[PDB]
Amino acid sequence: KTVHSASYDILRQQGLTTVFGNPGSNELPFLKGFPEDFRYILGLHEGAVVGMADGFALASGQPAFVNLHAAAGTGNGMGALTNAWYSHSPLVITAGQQVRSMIGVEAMLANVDAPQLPKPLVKWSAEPACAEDVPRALSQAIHMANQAPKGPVYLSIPYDDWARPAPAGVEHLARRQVATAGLPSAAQLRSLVQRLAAARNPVLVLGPDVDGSRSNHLAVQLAEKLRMPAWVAPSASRCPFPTRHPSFRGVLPAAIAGISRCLADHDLILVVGAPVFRYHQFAPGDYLPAGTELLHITCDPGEAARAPMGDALVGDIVETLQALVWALPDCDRPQPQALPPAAPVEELGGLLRPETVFDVIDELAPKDAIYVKESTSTVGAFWQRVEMREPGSYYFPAAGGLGFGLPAAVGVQLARPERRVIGVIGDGSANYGITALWTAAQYQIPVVFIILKNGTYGALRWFAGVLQVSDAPGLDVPGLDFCAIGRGYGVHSVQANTREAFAQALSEALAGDRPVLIEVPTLTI
């Protein structure tokens, strides 16, 4: 037995049998003898590697294993880690290191002070002090990433470690289970029941950990038991509730003053599975309406600690909601009434309007499609127009780090081969993760990649207009041909200029079993 055999035994028994990577010489001794029951997914750039792994871990509900090259490979993946942090993504990131005797002299490919490199975007990082501790360190990595609050971890491994003999006692590691006890106490449950049942007009607010914990159906039961509306917490990264349910109200605005206005008539706000709150725009005002109280249920002690208001309970979301639904009384206030349907937009005679594209998607897509969205000026219209009825149907970068979309679509589609993934990606956002197209071609992962091509960084032009700034450089992205780029990376590509051409292209893509890129020139104002 070697450090190598012991390590692959640990990965197999813990279920980490898909490796997302881009290889280098320090990693070859790990990749040696790669087992026939494991799968390796090559990305051409590490931002795409990490984002594929992120999508895979989130959609599968299991940890994902990554293998990168030394400091430059780790570095190229670091933007993608910002999103993985706020999505509570359990990524086990390994990077290969020089031989131990060559690290201090700073030989070429030595990753200097390796554990510091990924900080502060990892929950744990190490470089084992000896070859013999590597298998236990890898066990520690997997169980740190997969415990609440879940998140990325990092391990740097000198390449001469793998061939060394495994130590006595290593046989205990592969079978280890780490379980998290997160049910409320009887007193804690009583407090939630008393406060909710006593409220005049409560409201529900739901974040990405409602989807991550598979609590969507429980959230519907909760809303119905208290006859209350349900919103998505601001800066939404996942969809936690069926969007045409009559209690649904949309996504809250990412603004201090905006949330206290939207929720002004409610005496009690219950936030589940989000921070309080991922505000974005500067909009000073009241954190809460006068007389309103807030309750917060979260899996993350740091979310509970940092909130500017409310009483928090930190624990297991699905067990907490199940207990709460059981313990609450029925209510006979009237049921909330549904939001009105979105009207078609006016025909203006220029390029296709995003609203039009979305109406077509809502008509032709399967009702359990999965959407991966990274198109920053069209978010409001998408949520209004594209129904998302089932869990696990939406992914948007949780840190707002662009380059998530194309790679995450490939990883999500790999995790959920029985559903169809449709990416809705801007011309700007596409270029941060463009080589994911190639991985989709090579492995025949049949994402429908829709590129909305408006010629600009539209969301930034909007924000610039708001600040009366007209002199900022760098906001336009002319001269891009995504059909040529798609074909370059091996993906069947088509340009759709009208509503009829777009419908035909989407229909034909959905009917097939290959990736397709659909380039859609769109209106921007």
Sequence ranges of the binding site for thiamine diphosphate: 376-377, 400, 402, 428-429, 454, 458-459
Binders in 3-22 for ligand TPP, by CB under 6 A: 22
Site string for a copy of itself, 476-495 (x = CB under 8 A): -xxxxxxxxx-xxxx-----
For position 438 contacting a copy of itself by CB under 8 A, the verdict is: yes
Binders in 442-461 for a copy of itself, by CB under 8 A: 442, 457, 459-460
Closest listed residue to residue 238, CA positions, set 46, 71, 86, 443: 86
State the DSSP H helix or E strand holding residue 16, giving kind and residue range, or none if neither. Answer: none
Among 280, 363, 508, 512, the one annotated catalytic = 280
Least distance in angstroms from the C-beta of 430 to Na ion = 9
Alpha-carbon distance 31 to 24, whole Å? 10
Grouping H, G, I as helix, E, B as strand and the rest as coil, residue 466 is: helix
Q: Which does 243 bind (CB under 5 to 8 A by kind): ligand TPP, a copy of itself, Na ion, none?
A: none
Alpha-carbon distance 208 to 212, whole Å? 6
Least distance in angstroms from the C-beta of 477 to Na ion = 6
DSSP single-letter state for residue 238: B
Least distance in angstroms from the C-beta of 26 to ligand TPP = 8
Q: Which of 17, 174, 250, 463: binder of a copy of itself (CB under 8 A)?
A: 463
For position 47 contacting ligand TPP by CB under 6 A, the verdict is: no
Q: Report the alpha-carbon angle 410-509-419, nearest 5.
A: 50
For position 480 contacting ligand TPP by CB under 6 A, the verdict is: no
Q: Which does 335 bind (CB under 5 to 8 A by kind): a copy of itself, Na ion, ligand TPP, none?
A: none
Q: Is 280 a catalytic residue?
A: yes
For position 80 contacting a copy of itself by CB under 8 A, the verdict is: yes
Q: Is 423 a catalytic residue?
A: no
Binding span for a copy of itself by CB under 8 A among 135-143, 331-339, 408-416, 473-481:
473-481
Q: Which of 79, 428, 433, 515: binder of Na ion (CB under 5 A)?
A: 428
Alpha-carbon distance 217 to 211, whole Å? 10
Helices 317-327, 216-225: axis angle to 10 degrees equals 30
Amino acid at 478: P
Residues present in the chain in total: 525
Closest listed residue to residue 230, CA positions, set 216, 241, 239: 241
**Nearby residues of 181 by Cβ (< 8 Å), 6 or more positions away:** 316
Q: Output b/e per residue, 83-105; b: 16+ Cβ within 10 A.
A: bbbbbbbbbbbbbbbbeeebbee
Q: Would you state the structure tokens that stand for residue 278, as one six-digit string?
A: 């991922």
Binding span for ligand TPP by CB under 6 A among 128-136, 383-391, 458-466, 485-493:
458-466
> What are 296's strand-pairing partners?
271, 312
Q: Which of 58, 71, 323, 370: binder of a copy of itself (CB under 8 A)?
A: 71
Q: Is 486 a catalytic residue?
A: no
State the DSSP H helix or E strand holding residue 411, giving kind and residue range, or none if neither. Answer: helix 405-415
Q: Which of 63, 152, 426, 486: binder of ligand TPP (CB under 6 A)?
A: 426
Site string for ligand TPP, 354-383 (x = CB under 6 A): ---------------------xxxx-----
> What are 232's strand-pairing partners?
206, 251
In the sheet that holds 492-495, the strands lie side by side as 394-395, 370-374, 421-426, 448-453, 516-521, 492-495
Site string for ligand TPP, 195-234 (x = CB under 6 A): ----------------------------------------
> Which residues fall in the annotated binding site?
376-377, 400, 402, 428-429, 454, 458-459
Q: Total binding residues for ligand TPP by CB under 6 A?
A: 26
Q: Which of 67, 94, 320, 454: binder of Na ion (CB under 5 A)?
A: 454
Least distance in angstroms from the C-beta of 47 to ligand TPP = 9
Q: Distance of CA 150 to CAs 59, 276, 397, Å?
A: 14, 18, 16
Q: Is 69 a catalytic residue?
A: yes
User: So which residues are the catalytic ones?
Assistant: 24-25, 27, 46, 69, 280, 400
